[PDB]
Amino acid sequence: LAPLFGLEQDRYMTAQIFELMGIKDTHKYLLPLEQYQPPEPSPMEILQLE
Amino acid sequence: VNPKQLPARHNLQVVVAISPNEKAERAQKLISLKQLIAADAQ
Amino acid sequence: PVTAGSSSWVDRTVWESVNGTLQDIINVFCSGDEAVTFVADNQQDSDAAD
């Protein structure tokens, strides 16, 4: 079921849990998915592919 | 702080009778959540 | 004191119950360092709760 349980579903689950316990989730490191740019790959996998 | 910028009571629930130690309680919850978010990399 | 020889020693009972209720009342509301704390239902209005 992981292929369907992507990132946004996990984020919504964690956000619901927080709302149940701690409301303001944006106050800190966790970022709204709308402005989450993808990670920048590192040179390690690049040189390994090379 | 603009007064017009604030919401209305329709979307503001209120709570009373808060224990002093509740802060610490929250802290515990937080660190618990921390562990959780540490286990999931997505 | 209807009469001197009666020595009508009063029984302070209302005061007793008043205090017995007031102590619990203050232990309910004024026990915490804070009075109340607003809580919202969405993240779009959580910045105003605190």
Side-chain angles (χ1 to χ4, degrees), chain B residues 6-27:
Chain B
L6 280 71
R9 300 178 293 93
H10 294 71
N11 316 323
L12 281 178
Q13 174 161 14
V14 56
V15 53
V16 195
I18 51 173
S19 174
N21 70 337
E22 64 92 18
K23 301 288 188 183
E25 211 62 11
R26 278 175 63 90

Side-chain angles (χ1 to χ4, degrees), chain A residues 5-7 10 18 21 30, chain B residues 26 29 33 36-37 40 42:
Chain A
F5 184 42
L7 181 65
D10 195 324
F18 284 134
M21 301 167 65
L30 284 201
Chain B
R26 278 175 63 90
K29 296 171 180 178
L33 302 164
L36 177 138
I37 180 166
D40 186 349
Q42 179 170 339

Side-chain angles (χ1 to χ4, degrees), chain C residues 11-48:
Chain C
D11 183 6
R12 293 277 290 287
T13 63
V14 186
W15 185 89
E16 192 175 354
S17 296
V18 169
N19 296 119
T21 55
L22 196 79
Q23 59 183 5
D24 284 338
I25 287 282
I26 62 174
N27 182 39
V28 159
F29 301 87
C30 199
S31 169
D33 52 17
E34 273 187 22
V36 312
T37 185
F38 300 109
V39 74
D41 43 17
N42 314 98
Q43 188 271 346
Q44 292 84 26
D45 47 359
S46 55
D47 283 18

Side-chain angles (χ1 to χ4, degrees), chain C residues 1-10:
Chain C
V2 298
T3 305
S6 87
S7 294
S8 55
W9 178 93
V10 183

Side-chain angles (χ1 to χ4, degrees), chain A residues 14-33:
Chain A
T14 54
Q16 287 289 127
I17 282 159
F18 284 134
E19 300 322 325
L20 295 187
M21 301 167 65
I23 286 165
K24 194 66 169 289
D25 71 326
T26 58
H27 161 269
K28 218 153 203 295
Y29 299 101
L30 284 201
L31 201 153
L33 196 65

